[PDB]
Amino acid sequence: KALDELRKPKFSSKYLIQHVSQKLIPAVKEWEKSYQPPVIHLGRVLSVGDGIARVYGLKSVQAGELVCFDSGVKGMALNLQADHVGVVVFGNDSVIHQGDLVYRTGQIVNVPIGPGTLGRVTDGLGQPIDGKGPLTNVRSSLVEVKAPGIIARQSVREPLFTGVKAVDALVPIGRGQRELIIGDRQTGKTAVAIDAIIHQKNCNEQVPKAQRVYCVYVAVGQKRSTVAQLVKLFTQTGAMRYTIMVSATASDAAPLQFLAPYSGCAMAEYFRDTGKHGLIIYDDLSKQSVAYRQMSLLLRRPPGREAFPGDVFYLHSRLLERAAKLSKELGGGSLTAFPVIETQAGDVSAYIATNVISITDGQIFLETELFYKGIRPALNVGLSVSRVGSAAQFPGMKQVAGTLKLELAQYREVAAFAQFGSDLDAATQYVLERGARLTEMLKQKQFAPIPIERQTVAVYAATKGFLDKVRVQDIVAAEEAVISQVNPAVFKILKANGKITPALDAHLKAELRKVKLPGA
Amino acid sequence: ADAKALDELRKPKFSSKYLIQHVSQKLIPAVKEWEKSYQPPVIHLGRVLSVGDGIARVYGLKSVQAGELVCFDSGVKGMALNLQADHVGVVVFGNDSVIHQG
Amino acid sequence: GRVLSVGDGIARVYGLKSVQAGELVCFDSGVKGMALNLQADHVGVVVFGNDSVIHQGDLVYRTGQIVNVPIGPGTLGRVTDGLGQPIDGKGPLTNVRSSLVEVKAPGIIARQSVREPLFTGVKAVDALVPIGRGQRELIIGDRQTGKTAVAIDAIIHQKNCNEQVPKAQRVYCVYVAVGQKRSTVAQLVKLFTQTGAMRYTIMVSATASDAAPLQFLAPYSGCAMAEYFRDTGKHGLIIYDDLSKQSVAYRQMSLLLRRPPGREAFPGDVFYLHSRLLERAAKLSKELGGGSLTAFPVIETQAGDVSAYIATNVISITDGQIFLETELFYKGIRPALNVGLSVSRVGSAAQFPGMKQVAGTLKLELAQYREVAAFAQFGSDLDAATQYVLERGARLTEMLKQKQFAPIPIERQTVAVYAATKGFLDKVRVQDIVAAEEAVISQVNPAVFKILKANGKITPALDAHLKAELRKVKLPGA
Amino acid sequence: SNQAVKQRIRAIKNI
Amino acid sequence: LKLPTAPLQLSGTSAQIATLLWQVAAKENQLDKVQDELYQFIELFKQHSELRRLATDPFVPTLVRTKIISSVLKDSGASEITKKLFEALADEGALSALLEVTVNYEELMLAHKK
Amino acid sequence: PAIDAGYVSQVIGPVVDVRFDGELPSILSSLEVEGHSVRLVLEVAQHMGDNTVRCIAMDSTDGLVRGQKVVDTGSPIKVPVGRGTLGRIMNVIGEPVDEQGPIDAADIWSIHREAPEFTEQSTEQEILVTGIKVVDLLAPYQRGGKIGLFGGAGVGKTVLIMELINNVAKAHGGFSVFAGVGERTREGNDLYREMIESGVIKLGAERGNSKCTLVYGQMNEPPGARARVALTGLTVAEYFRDIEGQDVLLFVDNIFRFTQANSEVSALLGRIPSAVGYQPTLATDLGGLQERITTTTKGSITSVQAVYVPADDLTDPAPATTFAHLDATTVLSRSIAELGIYPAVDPLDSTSRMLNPNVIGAEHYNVARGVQKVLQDYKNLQDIIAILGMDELSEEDKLTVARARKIQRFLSQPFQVAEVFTGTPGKYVDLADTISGF
Amino acid sequence: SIAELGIYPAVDPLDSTSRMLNPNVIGAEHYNVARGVQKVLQDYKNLQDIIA
Numbered sequence A: 001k002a003l004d005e006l007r008k009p010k011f012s013s014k015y016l017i018q019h020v021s022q023k024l025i026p027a028v029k030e031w032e033k034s035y036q037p038p039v040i041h042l043g044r045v046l047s048v049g050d051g052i053a054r055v056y057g058l059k060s061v062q063a064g065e066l067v068c069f070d071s072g073v074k075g076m077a078l079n080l081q082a083d084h085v086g087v088v089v090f091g092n093d094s095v096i097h098q099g100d101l102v103y104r105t106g107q108i109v110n111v112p113i114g115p116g117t118l119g120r121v122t123d124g125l126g127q128p129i130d131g132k133g134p135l136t137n138v139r140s141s142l143v144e145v146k147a148p149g150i151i152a153r154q155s156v157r158e159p160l161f162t163g164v165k166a167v168d169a170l171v172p173i174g175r176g177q178r179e180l181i182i183g184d185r186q187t188g189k190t191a192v193a194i195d196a197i198i199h200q201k202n203c204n205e206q207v208p209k210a211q212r213v214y215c216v217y218v219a220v221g222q223k224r225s226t227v228a229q230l231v232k233l234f235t236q237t238g239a240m241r242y243t244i245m246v247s248a249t250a251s252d253a254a255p256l257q258f259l260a261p262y263s264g265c266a267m268a269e270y271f272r273d274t275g276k277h278g279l280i281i282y283d284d285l286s287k288q289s290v291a292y293r294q295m296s297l298l299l300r301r302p303p304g305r306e307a308f309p310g311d312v313f314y315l316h317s318r319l320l321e322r323a324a325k326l327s328k329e330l331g332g333g334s335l336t337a338f339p340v341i342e343t344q345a346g347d348v349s350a351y352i353a354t355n356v357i358s359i360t361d362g363q364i365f366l367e368t369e370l371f372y373k374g375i376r377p378a379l380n381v382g383l384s385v386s387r388v389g390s391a392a393q394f395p396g397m398k399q400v401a402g403t404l405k406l407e408l409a410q411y412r413e414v415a416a417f418a419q420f421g422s423d424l425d426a427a428t429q430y431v432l433e434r435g436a437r438l439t440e441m442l443k444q445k446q447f448a449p450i451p452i453e454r455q456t457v458a459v460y461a462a463t464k465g466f467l468d469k470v471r472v473q474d475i476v477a478a479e480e481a482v483i484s485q486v487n488p489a490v491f492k493i494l495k496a497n498g499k500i501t502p503a504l505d506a507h508l509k510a511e512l513r514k515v516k517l518p519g520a
Numbered sequence B: 001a002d003a004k005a006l007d008e009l010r011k012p013k014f015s016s017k018y019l020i021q022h023v024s025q026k027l028i029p030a031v032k033e034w035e036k037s038y039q040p041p042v043i044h045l046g047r048v049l050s051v052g053d054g055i056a057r058v059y060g061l062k063s064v065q066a067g068e069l070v071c072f073d074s075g076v077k078g079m080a081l082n083l084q085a086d087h088v089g090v091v092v093f094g095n096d097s098v099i100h101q102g
Numbered sequence C: 001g002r003v004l005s006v007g008d009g010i011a012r013v014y015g016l017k018s019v020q021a022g023e024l025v026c027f028d029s030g031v032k033g034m035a036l037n038l039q040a041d042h043v044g045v046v047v048f049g050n051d052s053v054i055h056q057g058d059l060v061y062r063t064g065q066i067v068n069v070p071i072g073p074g075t076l077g078r079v080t081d082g083l084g085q086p087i088d089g090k091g092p093l094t095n096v097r098s099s100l101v102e103v104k105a106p107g108i109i110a111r112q113s114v115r116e117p118l119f120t121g122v123k124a125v126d127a128l129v130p131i132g133r134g135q136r137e138l139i140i141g142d143r144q145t146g147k148t149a150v151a152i153d154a155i156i157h158q159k160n161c162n163e164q165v166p167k168a169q170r171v172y173c174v175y176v177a178v179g180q181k182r183s184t185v186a187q188l189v190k191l192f193t194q195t196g197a198m199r200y201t202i203m204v205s206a207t208a209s210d211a212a213p214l215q216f217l218a219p220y221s222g223c224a225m226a227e228y229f230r231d232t233g234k235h236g237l238i239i240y241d242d243l244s245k246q247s248v249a250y251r252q253m254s255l256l257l258r259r260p261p262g263r264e265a266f267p268g269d270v271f272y273l274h275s276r277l278l279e280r281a282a283k284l285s286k287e288l289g290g291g292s293l294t295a296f297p298v299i300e301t302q303a304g305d306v307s308a309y310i311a312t313n314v315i316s317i318t319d320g321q322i323f324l325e326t327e328l329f330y331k332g333i334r335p336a337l338n339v340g341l342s343v344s345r346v347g348s349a350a351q352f353p354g355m356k357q358v359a360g361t362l363k364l365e366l367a368q369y370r371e372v373a374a375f376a377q378f379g380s381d382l383d384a385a386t387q388y389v390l391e392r393g394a395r396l397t398e399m400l401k402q403k404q405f406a407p408i409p410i411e412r413q414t415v416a417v418y419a420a421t422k423g424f425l426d427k428v429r430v431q432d433i434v435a436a437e438e439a440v441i442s443q444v445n446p447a448v449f450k451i452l453k454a455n456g457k458i459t460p461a462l463d464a465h466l467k468a469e470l471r472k473v474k475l476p477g478a
Numbered sequence D: 001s002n003q004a005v006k007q008r009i010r011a012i013k014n015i
Numbered sequence E: 001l002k003l004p005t006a007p008l009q010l011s012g013t014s015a016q017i018a019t020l021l022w023q024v025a026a027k028e029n030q031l032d033k034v035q036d037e038l039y040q041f042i043e044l045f046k047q048h049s050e051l052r053r054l055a056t057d058p059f060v061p062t063l064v065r066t067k068i069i070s071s072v073l074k075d076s077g078a079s080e081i082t083k084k085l086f087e088a089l090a091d092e093g094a095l096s097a098l099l100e101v102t103v104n105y106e107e108l109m110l111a112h113k114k
Numbered sequence F: 001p002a003i004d005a006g007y008v009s010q011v012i013g014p015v016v017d018v019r020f021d022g023e024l025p026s027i028l029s030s031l032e033v034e035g036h037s038v039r040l041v042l043e044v045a046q047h048m049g050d051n052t053v054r055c056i057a058m059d060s061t062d063g064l065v066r067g068q069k070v071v072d073t074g075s076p077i078k079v080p081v082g083r084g085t086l087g088r089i090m091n092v093i094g095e096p097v098d099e100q101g102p103i104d105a106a107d108i109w110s111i112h113r114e115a116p117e118f119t120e121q122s123t124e125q126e127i128l129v130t131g132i133k134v135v136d137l138l139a140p141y142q143r144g145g146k147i148g149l150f151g152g153a154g155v156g157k158t159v160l161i162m163e164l165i166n167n168v169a170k171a172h173g174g175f176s177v178f179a180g181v182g183e184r185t186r187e188g189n190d191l192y193r194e195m196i197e198s199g200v201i202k203l204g205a206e207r208g209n210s211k212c213t214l215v216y217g218q219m220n221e222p223p224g225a226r227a228r229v230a231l232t233g234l235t236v237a238e239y240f241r242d243i244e245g246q247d248v249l250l251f252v253d254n255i256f257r258f259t260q261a262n263s264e265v266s267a268l269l270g271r272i273p274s275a276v277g278y279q280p281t282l283a284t285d286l287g288g289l290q291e292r293i294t295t296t297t298k299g300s301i302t303s304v305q306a307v308y309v310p311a312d313d314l315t316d317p318a319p320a321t322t323f324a325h326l327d328a329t330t331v332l333s334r335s336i337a338e339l340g341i342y343p344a345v346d347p348l349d350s351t352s353r354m355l356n357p358n359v360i361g362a363e364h365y366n367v368a369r370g371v372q373k374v375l376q377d378y379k380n381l382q383d384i385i386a387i388l389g390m391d392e393l394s395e396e397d398k399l400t401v402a403r404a405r406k407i408q409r410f411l412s413q414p415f416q417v418a419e420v421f422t423g424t425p426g427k428y429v430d431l432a433d434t435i436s437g438f
Numbered sequence G: 001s002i003a004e005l006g007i008y009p010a011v012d013p014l015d016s017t018s019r020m021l022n023p024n025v026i027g028a029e030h031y032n033v034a035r036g037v038q039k040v041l042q043d044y045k046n047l048q049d050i051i052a
């Protein structure tokens, strides 16, 4: 039969009725007098749902262009399909109906950056939520920017002092690298980042204006009460004048959580482009990858491993590559990134964890087994790498850091032999007790950053045996006794001269002999 | 829609002829004036409907055997693995870049 | 309505604009169906039976009402499939009334606290993990460890008790065989009719040859047939044999409808599948009739895999858990109940009070025997305090053995338990206790068992007479 | 964590 | 802006075109004219091969199909509704949806013709 | 009534599509079905784009025909809140299911609302003594915080939450709201009788003197109802916090059932599934719930949310997402419950933000850290005790083994509610006494 | 693992393979040394279970 070829329809489109109704409703003779909705610069919402709106129209919209619904909520045009535009929603999608108008704004996504952003608890879109008014001394730059090239960078030289003894000796961090703090839940990651912020408050009042570090903390997917406690803490220490709090919490919409580290990186790149130094902590980057996974899976993109999209490596790559040490022709600024990736029961062979480990230079693996051994911070010293190495390590700390790494390397292999109490060797016992001295030396209470000169003196006093006479159980207070009972001149000249000179290593060699240790 | 309400259009049901009479004389010069922007219709031949990643979906080819060496007009050979209802999905022995849509 | 397409356990049915979601439709070939997915352009129909008799173009008639099975007192004794058609070959179901399989379980205000026990006749479970009427007690075990034997002895003891009690407290069992072999259901029907337990039992059998929605719907058919007895003031007992097989059949149903699978390729609502079913086993209040329904879900694990998906699903729904270990089954100890894992939440508040005050020391001695056997596997030292309670626990585990298909009444359970836990069966060689407790039940006067069933508590006169009677026992081993 | 269980299997077999 | 309601609701993406066609031709009260025109187009697809080649061939460009459907339907007293319908259905290659848009239109008109 | 009366278009399980001729309702609004056997409330979840909403039904859809008229309420699901709800049991749509007449309603609040903002948050850290030794020692509960009781399928998180109700909920002074999200109906009846017998629920005309409101959507309910009963319990608690302005308790049982009900619904909305089989919008739905359970400046909601883990798997995404929203975490383990220890709190995985040397004192903090150190050094030697035996260890290691075996037995405690099945009477321990004991 | 022991460059001596290791293309004086080094290293990893 000749009718069978036209039996079943072969559609090249889905919203065919939406194209037919733009040509049949003018065929009514009474509806030719401007009875047509324009779709050149406007757009009608076809289907809302789950924080995803699909908009018919928007012919002149750009990919990644921030559009605005007529309800007031904004949105980012992400999928530019052949017959509609898949628009994510930056807020609650309860305010959107089918048939609402979408007014595009012509702007790729913008956040207020500048010197007036300091101390402002803002979202991943730019609105402050701390209740201190709008942003005043700011300017509106792009969210997604191109990373600096190969000309625009120089070598990572100057160190970024953390204040934590387990990381400033073993895993040193220079001003301009990307150092990952990877661990499990409740292992000390956010606390290490907060110590890295509070040490900048302790440091910035001793250095000039060109050497100050302005922190930016990006809380993605956390609670609102956690960011409230952190704002209370940074105000109680007074470090809010150096800190920007970008906060897209768990109540906030999924594209806000997706764009929070990008917004924070744009707010922290202002100090990098103006010769200052910046420090950004993309806290809970795995929750940002989860928010991007949800935003893509509702946008009908084909999923891959663990139902993530393909370009989720690119998602963290183009975010982390904006952290660099610029050359002197471009201002000499720096941005030191600190991603935080949570693993689940130690599976480091996951997808997002391997991607962020493959991107970043260093890694700080905090383990939940050594957290409950009393070793706080829970730094696994074997797996932690720092690929600047001794190029940006503090001099003086470099004189004892090789000894610390080698002695802890022997103490890591002396294990599985200490469970036989009569099996004395008198040489593996010496390194076995020396490793306990060095391990319990590197403990710190939280929210207590130690300056780098006192760290160098305190680890010098332990790698040279000046706390070797005490027991293994009293080194947490003998450390404080060694810090207090020495002359204040030793730290005062060690911070200034830059290294342990031969004109100092005979002074504090004897100043450790006039100390009182609580054990003999 | 169902088939029962769709078979009954095979019988003529217009009860007027003010459209099928006039445009039946207009349609042949209308398809004559766009003879240049056509392609010759393929029944026992095969026209490439799409091509990608070394796989060309070939419209036509009404009498291929499943697994028959088809040969493109680029000189590259193929192998009709799956035969769909409307098109033939062949594979490409070599460079897929010398095969365009058409 | 016409059939558009049939395959993968679904019938895309054109038309039926007046059909309901969940309406029992009936094809022209006689095979039934359920209008599951009411789409905008067709009606998805799962096929209760073999779909090889259904073509494109077959007519689908609606029956006018939701999927219903004939329930009532005419089902007692009739072996039905998942829709209540009798396959025993004894004619149609007379004296019956059709009612729905998919009903809401009664709410918070309708249940009442479990007070009275459900005697199962196996002295191991009724002495260690006691069950009230209105209790969901999961029998979880391995493959071939004797779960079905525990359920069978429960049904047979319900038959044995049903003629010693008035009409107002009688238990009408329901056996739901999902995924079992047809041969095994035949042996079980022959056993239930040669012991006389088919006077009180319905056999709802969807065997392994039957289609997947039949194995899906057979526990709902059994639960409707037992909810007849629960709703009218009588009592009910129901055993879902191998709910793991019912969950596998629902996995087949879900994966043949292109639904996204979750853990272990199960659908998202396999918890809701078993919560829809096991929550209808209730103990209603005094306003609704005072009826009851006791469930016994059977779960087959793989290697003691209590942490599987379906096992942890049905554990979280039921009130108790009975774990049957295979390492106690292969050492001759039958039934092989694992007392370190088996527990009844309803438990001691609603059990036999004589057993409530004779078996606390029994589980205490078994706890201390578990403490001894956890350390004395090696044969290191004999401290003469671990060794005494080691011998007491060995005598108690030998006392808690049982021969199959022989359920023991509750007074002969607690007399043997009292003779075991008070030291009267001491200095007997442990391979002779299985004759010793039989002789103890045989030699104590039946007036003692009669008065102990009557008052239901060990009186101060009863134990004083029972100690003196247990001195007069010709126990082997001397 | 499906490498750690294999390494634990290898250590237990070597023991 | 103010469209008269269809007498019976229907399915999607081919019945929606028939719903809009019944709504527009009921605003214009040409409800039996366009049914005759759609019947004429069904038989016109039955007659010749150069017109069903505009709906089964996937290598016809959309420009020549749009210009053929405009230059054919320029004359012969065709309705504005059927002309703009066939223009919009030939611009998107939906000419093969004619056979199942007219059936839903007939169901709609049979609901109305009471 | 031609406009604003839509008809049911299609039904896929608990997902009902309504098609309208004009004025589609807003998302998250409640619809009513005309001529259904029970009052079936739909709730719009999407807009499908052909004048069609995609609704979640709060009851069964068995018996829905695709011609049934559906009216719009023009509002979300609104529950009766106020002081008059004290002592009532409510389902997901605010009806009484305890058969005591209608609910005395001060106001009619919807269940969909925005979370309180950043400036309305309170930053307070005061302890909540519960009497359990492991909770008051190793992970002390914040008074006005969030508490998660992880562990699954017979570890005792439902016994522990009844013990927490029995301990804190009578010595609190403020109100309480129990929101049973998909737990057993029998457990709800048990708690109703046990709260009538204890006096925190009264009947008759003296109903207002009670101090506990029950909201039950228990595990017999369809997945439309279990996805919204937590929001109803939140609305009832948020009326007391936001308007009455006083501190409450909010014990939500099995908050995994909320995520599971939304996963059962989101299988049939045609969304692409995420990791192991859950919905893609897990974290945002759980955030939009869990950020409403927060202590503001005017009041406090002290929540103890039991979290069921699936197949004892903490790397499952449904509890691992929930781990970020909790202040004090109490992980229960079955490997300790099979050792007879009760309550089976895992001491080396259950943490809290209250365990800080500035808050609870350096004595309590150092005792807790020493206990964690002793248990962790015991846990490192477990294979050596397994294969090589106790007879080759060091002296200090076989002293820490004995100290750890003493503190593992010592962390166990008989409960005031567990004595119905165990015989041992429960012991409420004070805080300084268990600190001194450890 | 060899990077954990501080030996850098952390080349695994028992997975590094080459087609230049044929004794025709480099001679016996290199192939016998390479094979002996591989043999003693694999025997040391085999004996590493009991010496640890």
Ligand SMILES: Nc1ncnc2c1ncn2[C@@H]1O[C@H](COP(=O)(O)OP(=O)(O)OP(=O)(O)O)[C@@H](O)[C@H]1O
Residues within 6 Å of the ligand: A184, A185, A186, A187, A188, A189, A190, A191, A192, A376, A377, A444, A445, A446, A447, F323, F324, F352, F353, F355, F356
């Ligand atoms: N140096 C330290 N001394 C003592 N305790 C510490 C130290 N550092 C961290 N802690 C404790 O460890 C915990 C670390 O929690 P943290 O802030 O790392 O949460 P997280 O792991 O980032 O995220 P989540 O809350 O999801 O687990 C804190 O509760 C803190 O009390």
Ligand SMILES: Nc1ncnc2c1ncn2[C@@H]1O[C@H](COP(=O)(O)OP(=O)(O)OP(=O)(O)O)[C@@H](O)[C@H]1O
Residues within 6 Å of the ligand: C142, C143, C144, C145, C146, C147, C148, C149, C150, C300, C334, C335, C402, C403, C404, C405
């Ligand atoms: N109390 C008992 N005394 C003696 N033998 C028993 C007892 N209980 C069970 N058995 C034996 O155990 C074997 C299996 O028992 P049963 O058939 O009850 O297991 P099942 O739960 O059906 O296992 P499956 O479902 O995998 O077949 C039978 O051969 C039966 O003889």
Ligand SMILES: Nc1ncnc2c1ncn2[C@@H]1O[C@H](COP(=O)(O)OP(=O)(O)O)[C@@H](O)[C@H]1O
Residues within 6 Å of the ligand: C315, C316, C343, C344, C345, F151, F152, F153, F154, F155, F156, F157, F158, F159, F160, F342, F343, F413, F414, F415, F418, F421, F422
């Ligand atoms: N403190 C305790 N002491 C003794 N047994 C307990 C205790 N807590 C829980 N259990 C055991 O756990 C069982 C029920 O656990 P439950 O609280 O229901 O956990 P879930 O709700 O996850 O199943 C009870 O039968 C009880 O025997």
Ligand SMILES: [Mg+2]
Residues within 6 Å of the ligand: A189, A190, A191
């Ligand atoms: Mg944190």
Ligand SMILES: [Mg+2]
Residues within 6 Å of the ligand: C147, C148, C241, C242, C298
């Ligand atoms: Mg069986």
Ligand SMILES: [Mg+2]
Residues within 6 Å of the ligand: F157, F158, F159, F183, F184, F187
């Ligand atoms: Mg429970």
